[PDB]
Design a protein around this nucleic acid. Structure first.
Lengths: 214, 52, 694, 147, 413, 55
RNA sequence: AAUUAUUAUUAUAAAUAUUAUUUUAAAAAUAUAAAAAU
């Protein structure tokens, strides 16, 4: 996929995807003059070329494409990023003890520091949209991420991470304030609120646990 | 990389290979990115003398 | 029972079967049995009894069969199969096309030769034969055989003596009758009221292949509508008589007859004024045809607050004063309607109003009036499942809060990349409405930043969601890739609402609901992009009427120049005449228009219809059809099975012998889909079972 | 036929009374009008044509014995299929077949290459052997011209 | 002569004078051993030309060197297996740790939304069942999370069984350990390693089945019955007391009618017909033990056996509205059932057998009885069919073996 | 042969009906109401029921 | 004889073993092969 990730993906093709000089240059050669001066970079002599190149990711013009825009994917995706680039062995020694890990593990702490600044900068525009229909089970890990990356949770990203983090905080307390007087979510299939007691209690528990942290 | 490259204010770009190119032939290529506008690859024919 | 007809009078000499069914009992059979093999034995069974039936029954059954037709396109297009004997394909008209060509062949004998008195008596019959003869496009029989408008067949037109196209050769169905109907309009009409003088004037326009009506035909009624007026003295003020002008002015706009006098009055007499007190200028309002049309004003009466017919009509008049003259009569009509608190007059006046603004040269004055009159609100209230979004799109401020809308010289929205600046505000996300309908509606001008970040933006057309919704549905899924998009217009919505209720068959209207369920409930979820009326005015070129067939294209010619990085696709059917805007839809030839019309910044966005380039940069992928699974053809006639209906088969079974296994009694060749029983046939020596459902 | 490169949108309906005018010449002027060469906006790609109505064909003229010694020869595929037919022999069959043949000699002259340009200009001439013609409603304007 | 190239795997013609070949029947092409020269590599042993050499090594490092454990390591390994009570109390906690995070299936009208993906919990679930040996199809636990009625009942039936597994112990385990513990002997089979046989279905062994049907409730909501029938009938090893035994025997037969198996629908119902009536017949459960053992016969077309069970259900259980309607439901097919009562007309009804013959059923022009008959799990070419001496079959020309003339024929021995 | 065939000419073979009437055709079928497998009308099973009556 | 191929490799001995490979539901030319007479 030329240009790599139009909006969603992290991958792209910049300065490491070369220019192959020995092949029949596929498309956008509107005119035959485009052999000695293809003059790509011009925006119209580029949309002709860039579109027919490595598939502008569409799975096949009717095949099933992935649902990456939704909070039900981005945030349990970001769970695996920091749960891998920072294994719990770093999380334990950071969360529990304040003592210095070591230079190596301090690099692995900063190696993943600027790995969040990547998956954020790429998939931030998506996070704000599905914030509307985002669910509390997923609005609750947004603070629980920047811990394993060891960052204090509270255009450029900083302007937009703030307003979003302020935006989510209210929507969490709304729901938590919507829980104390919770209507009947299911009078059928589960009219007895079981597993909803502890799981939503531990939410209210684990929500304020990060507040002092943040 | 042996290539001079200019970024125009509409997102367009252009490159100018300067491999084995002397200093005088870089400045000349320097002055030729500021000149053009990188908007149309038109053949100077008798039909395209007037763009509008 | 096997009753209903009676053999001819003199039996052993003529055995022809008469007819004795009541017109009701033909229509009941026509309706309860919509299959083709029953809908043929009804048309034919009726056209044989067309010389006995009364002038009123002739009105009914004619007006009745039109329920099976549709003004849109191919008239008698009931095809059987597309045979592929040779490379290309040809189309075979079913027994039901030959049944109307037979029916119309019995009308042109009863009304032309053997009973020429039949049509002068009942004036509403001719005003129904005409409109029927237009729905069945008998001036163009080629489309009864044509499937793809792009692939025009000559099956009914072109024959070769080698022996091709002989039986379906040169077809002349009503060209005898259709030209006797005009011998009846010239030189009688004393028993014609103005409601029919108009309709008859509307018949001869529609039936013609392009709407021209052979002016002596038309001019014989205009000459008769003045005599209906001279007895009142051209001071008519019956409010319903002030409607028959708004219709007389829509006609003579399809015909293209340009008579100022009817506008010199319908407008109010503003012209023929503003032609008084001249210091030094032209006298455009007159365009006098005085010897032909009568001086006419209405009165000191209403003289204002017209109806929808008038506004879609004045669109065609290119005169600068007439629009400012008709731009208050739209305010008054939007004042009187709002104060009257009526819905139908409030939507009708808008969808017929945008056609007026879409003609003014000043796009600003066109855009000013579009927000002071809540066009983006009242239009969408109508569309079936849009009432939810129209609320939200009509949020108290951001309904249309004077977006930057920076138009440059030439009228083109050169705001692109300088409205991409947005004034730096990020067009905020979630707003209010605690029910988490909080994601704000995606008006194009507010969300032009997104279309830039989009990978491949899609455009919808009312056809791609007709005949099925399995192609939009896929794009509904791909919306949540973040990379893709989808743009529907307030025109494509309205043009879906028509085919949502005014559909030939329920199997099609049911779609345009399920085709509007999604788009109205994918717009409220902030996934799609609604280009509203406020922006269809923004993008369109000033002076050109750009319906949904060109809003699909002027958008793809706007954004293929003002944001060239992203793809553009067109959800439509391969049968749409808008699949090739170069072939159809092209403008008048002109020497100045180039092939570079698309990218030049000074040219209107529809100048690019004179190029194969616009079609080149806009892709047209068939996203995904329904599966290619074959339908149950076990119940249809089969040239292979046909040899087995009567094939002796004694040695095939041993214990369970039946009377005749293959032969389905009453059907044609054991084909449970080709039903024939209880339909009128004649076989005085072979049995037949009566009708039962299946 | 809509088919961009057609241009039925600026049509003018001419009328060339063929009475007394030479048949190898009425076929020339009518071609400048069907091929649309009389138009200052003529570009060979566009077939901007103007319908001509050449009434009164049977009154054509052929200088000298060129009614008796000019052949309309066409050689079919069957061996020994060469056909020779005078003008006074095709005029027995159909007088418009001699004018439609002399038009075919003029439209071809500039458009032999492509089938779409060979035949499409030919469908613009309406060859009527006498006064009567169904195009009263097309207002055929009598084009002025002096041979 | 010699039109192509000089290699033996060339393309055009050749000659034996210029380019004398060794007659190589079938060797490998330039792009690798196709599936024709490997039919030998797994039967003949080496490629059939004889010239190539059988490097059978990396298979030996695939099977044997992998399956080598010396004697002094064999007897000790089983002492090092995990405690599956843990991967039952650990996976069930992790399985829940994802089942909570699976999105609620979208509800946008105009088009059915797509069910959530399944890669999230496919790995922990793979652990849960693998110890239990009751393999569940992820669709059951992927449509359950989708259905608005089951997304909560299912998840919470896991939270509660997880509770009744981290409170009690894995009772179907000890059942295998008490065998190694009872019949008095100082050997218990370990210290039972499952906490801190004569019991009934324990707490967990009831809640275990609880979520199994709740698993198998998502199956029916997707209508994949013959995998649900493997979910329910697998729990049938978990009931040792005849109260819940009849309950789960009602479930299986309430999933065999749809599944198309109309024979086993009786047996699963006939057990519901011998274990149900212990409770007050006023609740809708009393009657259900008999209807299935007689609805399965109104589905099996033998109405006269069904005409008696709905009669036997009338006497014991006073008024089961379902059993009451079957009493009259058998009066609509009369006489069309009893008059038109042939012993073989079985108009196949459902899809569970309409689908199970698209697979697993004979085809045409392949997979029929004329292609390759299988005999003792070995495929035989159609000729060598020991179940027929019909034409073509080699048995026609066996002979008589110099023994007794056992045939009266002249040209056909 | 007198030359090699360009690809647009090997596809020319696939235009006519003699190619589509040999490869690209799908048969109408149906489940035998007893034999439970797909079937064409005319050809029957071996089962004594699928063979006495002829579904 | 390039072969699992036109093949009784026969120096010898011989005479009642059913002693174990040959697809296909059309039409022409051809190819083998076929009632009647100068």
């Amino acid at each position: 996929c030329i240009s790599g990730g139009g909006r969603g993906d992290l991958f792209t093709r910049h300065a490491s995807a070369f220019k192959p000089p020995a092949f029949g240059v596929l498309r956008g050669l509107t005119h035959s003059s485009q052999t000695t001066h293809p003059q790509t970079g011009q925006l119209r002599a580029r949309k002709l070329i860039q579109h027919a190149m490595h598939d502008r990711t569409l799975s096949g013009s009717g095949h099933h494409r992935t649902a990456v825009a939704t909070w039900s994917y981005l945030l349990p995706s970001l769970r695996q990023n920091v749960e891998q680039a920072v294994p719990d062995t770093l999380y334990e020694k950071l969360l529990t003890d304040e003592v210095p890990l070591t230079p190596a593990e301090s690099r692995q702490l900063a190696d993943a520091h600027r790995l969040l600044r990547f998956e954020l900068q790429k998939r931030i525009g998506l996070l704000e949209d599905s914030l509307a229909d985002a669910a509390l089970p997923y609005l609750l890990q947004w603070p629980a991420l920047f811990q394993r990356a060891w960052l204090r949770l509270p255009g450029a990203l900083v302007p937009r991470l703030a307003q979003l983090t302020r935006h989510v905080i209210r929507c969490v307390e709304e729901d938590l304030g919507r829980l104390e007087h919770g209507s009947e979510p299911r009078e059928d299939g589960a009219p007895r609120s079981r597993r909803q007691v502890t799981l939503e209690a531990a939410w209210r528990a684990q929500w304020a646990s990060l507040l002092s942290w943040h | 990389e042996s290539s001079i490259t200019g970024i125009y204010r509409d997102g367009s770009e252009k490159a100018y290979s300067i491999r084995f190119l002397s200093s005088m032939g870089i400045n000349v290529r320097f002055h030729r990115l500021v000149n053009e506008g990188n908007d149309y690859n038109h053949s100077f024919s008798a039909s395209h003398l007037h763009l509008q | 029972d096997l009753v209903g007809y009676h053999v001819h009078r003199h039996f052993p000499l003529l055995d022809v079967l008469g007819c004795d069914r009541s017109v009701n009992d033909l229509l009941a059979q026509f309706w309860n049995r919509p299959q083709r093999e029953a809908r043929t034995a009804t048309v034919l069974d009726f056209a044989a009894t067309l010389q006995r039936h009364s002038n009123e029954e002739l009105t009914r059954v004619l007006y009745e069969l039109s329920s099976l037709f549709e003004w849109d396109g191919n008239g008698l297009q009931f095809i059987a199969a597309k045979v592929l004997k040779y490379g290309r394909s040809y189309t075979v008209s079913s027994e039901l096309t030959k049944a109307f060509v037979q029916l119309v062949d019995a009308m042109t004998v009863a009304f032309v030769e053997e009973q020429p008195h039949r049509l002068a008596e009942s004036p509403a019959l001719l005003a129904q034969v005409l409109h029927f003869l237009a729905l069945v496009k008998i001036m163009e029989p080629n489309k009864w055989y044509t499937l793809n408008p792009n692939a025009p067949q000559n099956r009914a037109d072109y024959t070769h003596p080698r022996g091709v196209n002989r039986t379906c050769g040169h077809v002349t169905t009503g060209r005898a009758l259709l030209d006797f109907l005009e011998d009846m309009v010239t030189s009688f009409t004393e028993g014609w009221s103005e409601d029919d003088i108009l309709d008859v004037m509307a018949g001869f326009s529609g039936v013609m292949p392009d709407g021209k009506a052979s002016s002596p035909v038309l001019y014989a009624l205009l000459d008769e509508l003045w005599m209906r007026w001279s007895k009142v003295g051209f001071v008519l003020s019956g409010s319903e008589q002030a409607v028959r002008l708004e219709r007389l002015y829509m006609l003579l706009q399809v015909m293209d007859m340009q008579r100022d006098a009817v506008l010199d009055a319908l407008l109010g007499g503003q012209l023929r004024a503003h032609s008084t007190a001249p210091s030094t200028s032209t006298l455009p309002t007159l365009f006098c045809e005085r010897d032909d049309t009568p001086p006419l004003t209405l009165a000191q009466s209403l003289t204002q607050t017209r109806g929808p017919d008038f506004f879609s009509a004045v669109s065609r008049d290119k005169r600068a004063m007439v629009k400012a003259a008709a731009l208050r009569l739209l305010t008054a009509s939007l004042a009187k309607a709002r104060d009257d608190s009526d819905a139908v007059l409030h939507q009708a006046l808008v969808e017929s109003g945008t056609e007026l603004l879409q003609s003014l040269t000043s796009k600003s004055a066109a855009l000013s009036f579009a927000q002071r009159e809540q066009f983006d609100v009242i239009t969408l209230r109508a569309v079936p499942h849009m009432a939810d979004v129209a609320e939200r799109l009509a949020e108290q401020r951001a309904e249309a809060p004077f977006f930057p809308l920076t138009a440059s010289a030439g009228g083109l929205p050169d705001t692109a990349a300088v409205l991409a600046h947005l004034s730096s505000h990020p067009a905020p996300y979630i707003v209010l409405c605690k029910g988490r309908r909080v994601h704000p509606v995606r008006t194009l001008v507010s969300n032009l930043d997104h279309v830039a970040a989009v990978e491949n933006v899609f455009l919808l057309h009312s056809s791609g969601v007709s005949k099925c919704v399995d192609a939009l549905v896929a794009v509904a899924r791909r919306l949540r890739s973040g990379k893709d998009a989808l743009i529907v217009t307030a025109s494509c919505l309205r043009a879906l609402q028509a085919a949502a209720q005014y559909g030939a068959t329920e199997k099609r209207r049911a779609t345009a609901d399920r085709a509007l369920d999604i788009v109205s409930y994918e717009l409220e979820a902030g996934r799609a992009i609604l280009m509203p009326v406020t922006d269809e005015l923004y993008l369109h070129d000033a002076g050109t009427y750009c319906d949904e067939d060109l809003m699909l294209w002027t958008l793809a010619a706007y954004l293929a120049r003002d944001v060239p990085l992203v793809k553009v696709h067109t959800i439509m059917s391969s049968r749409s005449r808008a699949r090739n805007p170069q072939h159809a839809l092209r403008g008048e030839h002109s020497p100045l228009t180039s092939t570079d019309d698309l990218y030049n910044k000074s040219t209107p966005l529809l100048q690019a219809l004179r190029s194969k380039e616009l079609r080149a940069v806009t892709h047209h992928p068939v996203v995904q059809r329904p599966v290619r699974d074959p339908p149950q053809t076990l119940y249809n006639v089969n040239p292979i099975r046909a040899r087995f209906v009567y094939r002796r088969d004694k040695a095939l079974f041993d214990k369970y012998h039946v009377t005749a296994r293959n032969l389905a009694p009453g059907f044609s060749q054991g084909a449970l889909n080709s039903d024939l029983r209880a339909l009128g046939f004649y076989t005085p020596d072979h049995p037949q079972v009566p009708y039962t459902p299946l | 036929m809509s088919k961009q490169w057609l241009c039925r949108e600026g049509e003018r309906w001419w009328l060339l009374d063929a009475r007394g005018q030479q048949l190898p010449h009425v076929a020339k002027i009518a071609a400048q009008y069907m091929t649309g060469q009389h138009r200052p906006d003529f570009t060979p790609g566009m077939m901007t044509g103007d319908h001509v109505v050449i009434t009164n064909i049977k009154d054509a003229v052929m200088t000298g014995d060129n009614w008796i010694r000019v052949p309309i020869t066409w050689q079919t595929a069957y061996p020994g299929g060469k056909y020779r037919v005078r003008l006074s022999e095709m005029y027995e069959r159909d007088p418009c077949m001699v004018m439609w043949w002399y038009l075919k000699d003029e439209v071809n002259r500039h458009f032999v290459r492509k089938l779409k340009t060979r035949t499409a200009p030919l469908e613009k001439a309406w060859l009527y052997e006498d006064s009567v013609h169904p195009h009263a409603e097309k207002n055929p304007r009598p084009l002025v011209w002096t041979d | 002569y010699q039109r192509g190239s000089w290699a033996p795997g060339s393309k055009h013609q050749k000659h034996m004078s210029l380019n004398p070949t060794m007659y190589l029947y079938r060797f490998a092409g330039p792009h690798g051993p196709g599936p024709y020269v490997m039919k030998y590599w797994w039967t003949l042993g080496c490629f059939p030309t004889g010239i190539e050499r059988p490097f059978r090594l990396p298979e030996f490092l695939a099977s044997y060197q992998q399956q080598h454990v010396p004697i002094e390591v064999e007897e000790w390994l089983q002492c090092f297996v995990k405690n599956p009570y843990e991967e039952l109390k650990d996976a069930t906690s992790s399985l829940l740790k994802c089942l909570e995070e699976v999105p609620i299936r979208e509800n946008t009208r105009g088009y059915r939304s797509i069910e959530s993906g399944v890669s999230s919990f496919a790995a922990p679930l793979a652990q849960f069942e693998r110890q239990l040996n009751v393999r569940v199809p992820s669709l059951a636990v992927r449509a359950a999370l989708g259905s608005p009625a089951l997304r909560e009942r299912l998840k919470d039936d896991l939270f509660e069984y997880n509770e009744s597994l981290s409170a009690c112990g894995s009772t179907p385990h000890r059942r295998l350990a008490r065998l190694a513990f009872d019949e008095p002997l100082t050997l218990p089979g370990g210290i039972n390693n499952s906490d801190d046989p004569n019991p009934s279905t324990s707490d967990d062994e009831k809640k275990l089945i609880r979520l199994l049907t709740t698993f198998s409730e998502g199956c029916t909501l997707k209508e994949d019955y013959e995998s649900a029938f493997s979910l329910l009938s697998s729990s049938l090893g978990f009931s040792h007391d005849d109260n819940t035994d009849g309950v789960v025997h009602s479930n299986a037969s309430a999933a065999a009618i749809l599944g198309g198996l109309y024979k086993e629908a009786e047996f699963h119902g006939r057990q519901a017909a011998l274990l149900e009536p212990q409770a007050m017949s006023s609740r809708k459960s009393g009657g259900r033990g008999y209807v299935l053992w007689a609805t399965a016969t109104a589905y099996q077309e033998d109405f006269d056996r069904a005409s008696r069970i709905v009669e036997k259900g009338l006497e014991v259980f006073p008024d089961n509205a379902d059993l009451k309607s079957i009493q009259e439901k058998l009066a609509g097919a009369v006489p069309a059932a009893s008059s038109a009562s042939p012993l073989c007309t079985r108009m196949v009804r459902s899809k569970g057998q309409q689908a199970r013959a698209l697979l697993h059923g004979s085809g045409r022009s392949f997979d029929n009885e004329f292609d390759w008959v299988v005999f003792k799990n070995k495929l035989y070419p159609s000729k060598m069919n020991p179940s027929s001496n019909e034409m073509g079959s080699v048995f026609r020309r066996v002979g008589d073996f110099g023994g007794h003339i056992s045939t009266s024929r002249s040209l056909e021995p | 042969p007198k030359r090699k065939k360009n690809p647009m000419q090997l596809r020319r073979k696939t235009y006519g009906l003699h190619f589509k009437e040999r490869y690209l055709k799908l048969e109408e079928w149906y489940f035998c109401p007893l034999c439970a497998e797909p079937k064409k009308q005319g050809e029957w099973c071996r089962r004594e029921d699928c063979r006495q009556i002829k579904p």
